[PDB]
Amino acid sequence: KNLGRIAQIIGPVLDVAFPPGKMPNIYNALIVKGRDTAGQPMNVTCEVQQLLGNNRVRAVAMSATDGLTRGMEVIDTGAPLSVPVGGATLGRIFNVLGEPVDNLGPVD
Amino acid sequence: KKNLGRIAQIIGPVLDVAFPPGKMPNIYNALIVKGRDTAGQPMNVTCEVQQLLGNNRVRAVAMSATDGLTRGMEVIDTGAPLSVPVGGATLGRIFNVLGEPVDNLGPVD
Amino acid sequence: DEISKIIRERIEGYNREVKVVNTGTVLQVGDGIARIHGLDEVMAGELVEFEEGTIGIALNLESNNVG
Amino acid sequence: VDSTASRYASALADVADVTGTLEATNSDVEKLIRIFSEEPVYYFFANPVISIDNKRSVLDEIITTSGLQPHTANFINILIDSERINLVKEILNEFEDVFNKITGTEVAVVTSVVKLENDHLAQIAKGVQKITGAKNVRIKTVIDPSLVAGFTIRYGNEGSKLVDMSVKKQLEEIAAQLE
């Protein structure tokens, strides 16, 4: 739940600062609320692949990192990568992280 | 031109020179070391810059022998790349990169 | 310890001098790239322009510098 | 700990030991720590896109407005000319520790819900003086309502040695009822 900041991004890898005591465990998702090319807000996820220490965690972004400036507000989920499961999954094509791309509709 | 650079680090063919904080030579300029040989006469080791190292320091490239240069020598910028004589003058003379006629003949235009 | 008002004023004035909101400065330019100081609000891939307009794009967005 | 910084602070502590101004220099670096708890002066000194001459001027101004010896100021001048200015916070945080080292005043840290008297502080201080060889033993307390039964003491080079009498009984018997 801790709200973090961007230190560095280098292509798809990231450096996310965090509160001095609280830190995500390794393989926790990182929600970075960004913007589009015209500034409408969009979300790019990341995954903690390493904990470098000194309140910095290494994050590999599942989406392309065009839309994410340095110092941007990063939000932690605490739990690992959640995906919807059940009868909704049958017959629908998904992305990497459960958000479907058949465009019949959203998930349930 | 009209400045003074200090040799700071010589790892063989590469040279670290420091300049006054304002005046800094462009990339691919031509330094000229006012060095000396083993006989002490003022001998030149012309020098091409490749990269701004930062912290008012640059990294360079020596166009001739490095054996005989000390940390604390002096160097002068020309403000331009290594100019070479052109035209009908340079016809029939051995030439080096320093624009020097190497064969035992007189000077050039 | 005592931070005087002339000292504080000179510090803040120089910091405003070096840190302009839209811009930054050049640290090192080695063989076709640049490590730019500052630019804490810029976007990776978003084009930058130097003095005398020689255009460049930004990739290596590090913490001290940006590539 | 032969860090990038510990050689600098040990050199300054050695200079203060030979010259004989150690307890003054600790107050000096406390003033400098209070200086470098702030962001603007630390950003002024750390960042590499400010020329050296105004740095000289403003450090001389801070020395004149704070009244210090060149015994201290030469260290900061050496730091800036060697571009280790980014680690002044580290050097000054470890210099009090190397002062405790070469002047034998071990910091003792305890944490509990503690509301102690001079008896607890004095007796545990003299005990750890006996078992650790402190010239003078000095104390510190931390008040935290988490630990119920007893305390949790920390000491050593980096607080590395720990013998807690609050929850080791707890966790020991929690692990031992299954064992």
- Please tell me the distance from the alpha carbon of residue C50 to that of residue B94, in angstroms, as a whole number: 42
User: Does B21 sit within 8 Å of D48, measured CB to CB?
Assistant: no
**Domain-located, residue C4:** no
- Please tell me the distance from the alpha carbon of residue D164 to that of residue C54, in angstroms, as a whole number: 64
Chain position carrying tokens 């050039």: B108
Chain position carrying tokens 């680690």: D87
- Please tell me the distance from the alpha carbon of residue B32 to that of residue B53, in angstroms, as a whole number: 19
DSSP one-letter code for B46: E
- Please tell me the distance from the alpha carbon of residue A85 to that of residue A98, in angstroms, as a whole number: 9
Residue numbers of the domain that contains D166: 105-179
The Cα of B72 is separated from the nearest Cα of chain C by a number of Å equal to 23
Same domain, D50 and D115: no
Q: Which three-class secondary structure state does DSSP give residue D88?
A: helix
Contact D166, D150 (CB under 8 A): yes
Chain position carrying tokens 């720590």: D33
Neighbours of chain A (3+ CB pairs under 8 A): C
Contact A92, A39 (CB under 8 A): no
Q: What angle do CA A36, C62, A28 make, to 5 degrees?
A: 65
User: Does C28 sit within 8 Å of B53, measured CB to CB?
Assistant: yes
Contact A76, A55 (CB under 8 A): no
User: Does D51 sit within 8 Å of B55, measured CB to CB?
Assistant: no
Contact A27, A79 (CB under 8 A): no
Interface with chain B: mutation pick from C25, C29, C37, highest number of B CBs within 10 Å: C29
User: Does C18 sit within 8 Å of D35, measured CB to CB?
Assistant: no
Resolution of the solved structure (Å): 4.3
The Cα of B51 is separated from the nearest Cα of chain D by a number of Å equal to 18
| Contact residues on chain B for D47, CB-CB shorter than 8 A | none
Q: Identify the burial level of B46 via C-beta atoms within 10 angstroms of its C-beta, where 0-12 means exposed, 13-18 middle and 19 or more buried.
A: buried
Strands across the sheet containing D105-112: D136-143, D105-112, D153-155, D161-163
**Domain-located, residue C26:** yes
Q: Which three-class secondary structure state does DSSP give residue C5?
A: helix
User: Does C62 sit within 8 Å of A8, measured CB to CB?
Assistant: yes
Please, what sign has the CA dihedral across residues D74, D80, D82, D85? positive
Q: Domain tally for chain D?
A: 2
- Please tell me the distance from the alpha carbon of residue C25 to that of residue B56, in angstroms, as a whole number: 14
The last residue of one of the domains, among D74, D104, D134, is D104
**Domain-located, residue C36:** yes
- Please tell me the distance from the alpha carbon of residue D51 to that of residue D58, in angstroms, as a whole number: 12
Same domain, D36 and D114: no
For the record, the structure tokens of B102 come out as 């190497």
* Inter-CA distances, C3 with B1, C11, C45, D40, D64, Å: 43, 10, 41, 11, 11
- Please tell me the distance from the alpha carbon of residue A37 to that of residue C60, in angstroms, as a whole number: 19
Q: Solving technique for this entry? A: cryo-EM
Residue whose C-alpha is closest to residue B38's, from B56, B62, B65: B65
Helices (H) and strands (E) in chain B, counts: 0, 6
Q: Domain tally for chain C?
A: 1
* Inter-CA distances, C48 with A72, C27, C62, D178, Å: 19, 15, 16, 65
- Please tell me the distance from the alpha carbon of residue D154 to that of residue A95, in angstroms, as a whole number: 51
